[PDB]
Amino acid sequence: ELDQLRQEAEQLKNQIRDARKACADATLSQITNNIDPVGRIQMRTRRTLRGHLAKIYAMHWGTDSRLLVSASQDGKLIIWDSYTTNKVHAIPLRSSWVMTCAYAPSGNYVACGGLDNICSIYNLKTREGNVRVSRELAGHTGYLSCCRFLDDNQIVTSSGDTTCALWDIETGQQTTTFTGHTGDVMSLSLAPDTRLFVSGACDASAKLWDVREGMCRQTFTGHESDINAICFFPNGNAFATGSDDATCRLFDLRADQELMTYSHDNIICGITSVSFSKSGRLLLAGYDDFNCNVWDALKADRAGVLAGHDNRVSCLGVTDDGMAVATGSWDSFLKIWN
Amino acid sequence: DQRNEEKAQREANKKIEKQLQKDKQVYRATHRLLLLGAGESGKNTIVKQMSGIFETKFQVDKVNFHMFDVGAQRDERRKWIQCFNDVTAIIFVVASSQTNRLQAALKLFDSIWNNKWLRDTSVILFLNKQDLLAEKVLAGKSKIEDYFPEFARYTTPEDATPEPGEDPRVTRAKYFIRDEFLRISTASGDGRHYCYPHFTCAVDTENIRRVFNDCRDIIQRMHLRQYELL
């Protein structure tokens, strides 16, 4: 019973590999050889946000390119004003361990997730005048890793129990559940149209998930080690993954294979966060070895190095307009690079 | 218009800074423990005597301690363990004695010890089920000799002190497991973080004082590292 199914799965994988080899008409590097190089990029630190006590695990920019949300392991969720280095909001979290934070596109709600397995959503309307828990969500057995706002009433969330959830914030119950993963789901990235999203996970595969259908349309397996973070190209047709094998990979949904691998021989340390720019020409990746690298997407070369963090850069975020880049590391500092 | 918004924002910044400077003393004074242990090992007895994560809040000698017990979590530990580098100590509680559980415990301790981001976090080590191990070795079943070959060609260390009422075979097994953990801890030989092994009974009140003294030694050695004396 098991043999006729495992051999059938191996045959289907071989058919997918043969279809990918048949559709591999050329390489991105070969056609992008005749492209003018970006060159060395110098980014200066313009602001430095110093409010956190413990390590800053994750961050998420706002859609107005003005306010940023940063979560720390001490139990503090801080909403920062990037321009003036002023702390707009301080929230004391019930659970100290928080692995993610997200800011709603409207801006009313901020969500945090952690080892407590409960996602806490806070309303910033403040009719009372004090920040209070709008809702707490407890549907995941595994450790909660990533959450992102689709809108005011729906939130896509990632957990360690090999499941991705879509939660209706008004009801407080999961709208749908995604069960395709065989490994811990490290992160997810929402596309700008919001029809689809991508989940990077510890099973060395990245999954394209359809929100309405509830199943994974595409599976990408180009990574040797755990995929720590995932982000979208601005058009929404491609995505980049940072993994522990010190390689960044750009995958195309329509091509259904790995377009490009970014790697360097000296850099053996892991990758913690990736994020594109507004145009997509520059890929910004926060590596384990105490620096961030700016990569030319077309030419697969290192445009720049941002060595502004003494400790490992846990999270990297890029504004929607593209004006600034904010990097959060485990030395309790936030660095803004322009 | 801009001046009023800047004023209000500066006042909010001042209030938040005052809140963070009142919480900074609390965060730096209160020390943190990660109670990691196998399911066979009695960490439930530990959280009785001493959601996803469980929390025990207490204080000894006007020193605040929070101990965090892993609750309902997936067996894949390789990502969330990185979050626990910031805690002052990882208390690792194993059972000494069906499936083999000592070797998996040794491998898990090796994984904790050799982690590059756990080279500054010290491990306090609890060897539980001393009475159960004594009953097993007195029963005449050579479970430890079958599981570990070195135990047969093993001599009890002279510096080690035997508790009264204990067979020399019991002490030989106890200090043999202690030397297994010592060899795993000393194989790296980095010296940045130290492991303290303490035998613990099924019912004992000394464990809180042992954790207090071990955390004293951890903080003192970390300060000595800062002063470059050690």
Epitope: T182, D226, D245 | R77, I112
Partner: nanobody
Framework: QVQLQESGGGLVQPGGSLRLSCAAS????????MNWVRQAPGKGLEWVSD????????SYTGSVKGRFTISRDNAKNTLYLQMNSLKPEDTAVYYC?????????????????????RGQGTQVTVSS
């Protein structure tokens, strides 16, 4: 795609000898520490033996220490396990597992049920 393919096994007699192979496809084989896990029928996963990146550091489970020989071939990309002086208590399903990260000493969750970086396994039975 990271894939591991165990080879060899079967029904064998005690006191005999047996060779196992692990075809490692889809990753840079030279940079990963790897190891063996076994599952006894009706029991949980327990660690067997390991081998580092270069192959200098080698360790075994005590119950099979001195009885197994692990060796990795980075040129031909295959992990080789030699098993002599077999025991009836050593019948199990064998898993050739890879440690998750490159250039790291620590193999955190190699011995867990739903771990995704191990092969499908092979059946080894020792009945007289």
């Amino acid at each position: 795609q990271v894939q591991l393919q165990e080879s060899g096994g079967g029904l064998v007699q005690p006191g005999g000898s047996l060779r196992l192979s692990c075809a490692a496809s889809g990753f840079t084989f030279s940079n990963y520490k790897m190891n063996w896990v076994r599952q006894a029928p009706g029991k949980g996963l327990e660690w067997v033996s390991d081998i580092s990146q270069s192959g200098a550091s080698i360790s075994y489970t005590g119950s099979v220490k001195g009885r197994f020989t692990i060796s990795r071939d980075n040129a031909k990309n295959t992990l080789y396990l030699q098993m002599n002086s077999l025991k009836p208590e050593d019948t199990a399903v064998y898993y050739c597992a890879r440690c998750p990260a490159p250039f790291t000493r620590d193999c955190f969750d190699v011995t867990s049920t739903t771990y995704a970086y191990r092969g499908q396994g092979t059946q080894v039975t020792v009945s007289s």
